[PDB]
Amino acid sequence: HHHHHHSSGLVPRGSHMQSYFPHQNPPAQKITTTIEDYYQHSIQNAYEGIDFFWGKKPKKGDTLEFWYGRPLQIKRVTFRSGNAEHITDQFYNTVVEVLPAFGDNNFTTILHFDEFGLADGDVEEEFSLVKAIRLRVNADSKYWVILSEIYIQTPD
Numbered sequence: 001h002h003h004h005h006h007s008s009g010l011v012p013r014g015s016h017m018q019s020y021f022p023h024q025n026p027p028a029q030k031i032t033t034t035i036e037d038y039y040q041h042s043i044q045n046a047y048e049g050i051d052f053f054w055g056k057k058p059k060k061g062d063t064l065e066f067w068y069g070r071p072l073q074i075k076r077v078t079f080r081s082g083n084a085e086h087i088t089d090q091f092y093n094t095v096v097e098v099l100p101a102f103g104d105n106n107f108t109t110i111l112h113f114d115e116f117g118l119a120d121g122d123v124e125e126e127f128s129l130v131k132a133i134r135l136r137v138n139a140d141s142k143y144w145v146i147l148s149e150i151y152i153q154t155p156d
């Protein structure tokens with residue numbers, strides 16, 4: 001019988017900097033997460049360019065997955081965590097992994113969230129034609145989590 005901590009008593013923001021960086025990403029067949037979202041800041045909204053994702057504390061084993069209906073060619077991946085209003089709310093101890101369309105029937109790590117809370121890089125050619133992209137959390141966090149940018153950049 002846990003006591004819900006009410007947070008919809010709204011306050012002036014601490015920072016006036018941009019909270020979210022939308023992109024048109026390739027259409028996903030399925031988007032899943034095991035992380036509870038907050039204040040309707042859904043992972044689908046973040047992927048689809050509507051608003052930032054805000055999740056509760058990640059736990060070891062949590063995933064956020066983007067599945068594609070046909071092999072998808074990707075050039076770069078960016079997941080930007082935290083934002084200026086919530087610099088603590090990063091993905092810690094989390095990988096970005098891809099499931100290649102052909103070549104490996106399991107996910108392979110392509111990026112880590114760095115000391116800025118950013119997982120960003122060019123995708124090597126062997127991982128560039130994908131079935132799915134996901135985040136996988138390797139440890140419990142003390143903090144909630146924000147994704148302020150998701151950009152799955154194609155080579156076109």
Ligand SMILES: CC(=O)N[C@@H]1[C@@H](O)[C@H](O)[C@@H](CO)O[C@H]1O
Pocket residue numbers: 007086088089142143144145
């Ligand atoms: C609405 C809000 O302030 N959400 C925060 C979150 O940013 C933070 O990481 C978490 C744990 O300290 O506590 C929540 O209340």
